[PDB]
Structure formats: C-alpha cells, structure tokens
Amino acid sequence: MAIQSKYSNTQVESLIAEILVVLEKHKAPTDLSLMALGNCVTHLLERKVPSESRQAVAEQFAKALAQSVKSNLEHHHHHH
Amino acid sequence: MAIQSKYSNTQVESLIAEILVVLEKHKAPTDLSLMALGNCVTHLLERKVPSESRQAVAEQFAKALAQSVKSNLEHHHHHH
C-alpha cells in the first residue's frame, strides 16, 4: 500500500539506533537497560498520554510486544 | 549498617535522562516516541534474551509496566 510518513521507517529506525547508541555509550546490562527503557515507556504515558488513554496504550503496547515475540516463534504458522 | 544498593540512583537517573534527551533533541511526536521505545525494548530481547525466556520477560515487563500505571490509578480502594 501507500503510506506517506513524516517519520519514515529510516527516521524511526535511526531514532531507535540512536537510543541504542545511548545504551551502548555506557554499555548498560540488559537488566538495567530494561529498567531504563521500561521507565521511559511509562514516562511517556505519565507525560503525554491522559489516564484513560494511558490504559489503552499500555494494553496495545503489551499486545504489540508480546505478538512481536510470538511472531519469531512461528512454529509451522499453524498450531501443528 | 545493613543496606544493599541494587544500582546507583544517579546512574539509573542519568541513563533514563540521556534517552529522554534523545527524544527531546529530535522532538519526537507521541506516535514516534512510543514506536521507537517499543521496538527498542524488543530489540534488546532479540539480542541477549532467547525466545524461551523472552516470552516470560515480555510478561514480566507487562506486569511491571501495567502495575506502575495502576499504582497511580488505584487510590480509591473502597467498593465494599
């Protein structure tokens, strides 16, 4: 399809790569990185997102993350 | 004297702050910031966390994230 984006996938990916550079800048361990990133996610909720939407975004964010992991699982892409 | 610091307060603070500064510098819209954050958290899993554990870590993250939000919402504990 045709999706014109102000924030192109190149922009997004480079933004992600840049915050990864921040993590690697101090090469924080996964445990500590998950802590920092996790609080940064909630940070955006408590900052930009009003409480009623704060719930909705949290749930969809969870489904997004969970199904991203459930995507690389694949396992025959059926059940059997 | 019986105290154990899991991490350095100023360390964690500066870590979170640095990533926030990245979002600040580029001035990322809510959609872009959440998208970048989500993929970043997942990309950490794609590195040092096998899918076997990744499923549980994702759930652990979902637990922590949602409970952090609800910790602000639920201060009206009297329906009985």
UniProtKB/Swiss-Prot annotation, chains A, B:
Protein name according to UniProt: UPF0352 protein SO_2176
Record family assignment: Belongs to the UPF0352 family.
Classification lineage: Bacteria, Pseudomonadati, Pseudomonadota, Gammaproteobacteria, Alteromonadales
Pfam families the UniProt entry points to: DUF1414
InterPro entries, A to Z: UPF0352, YejL_sf
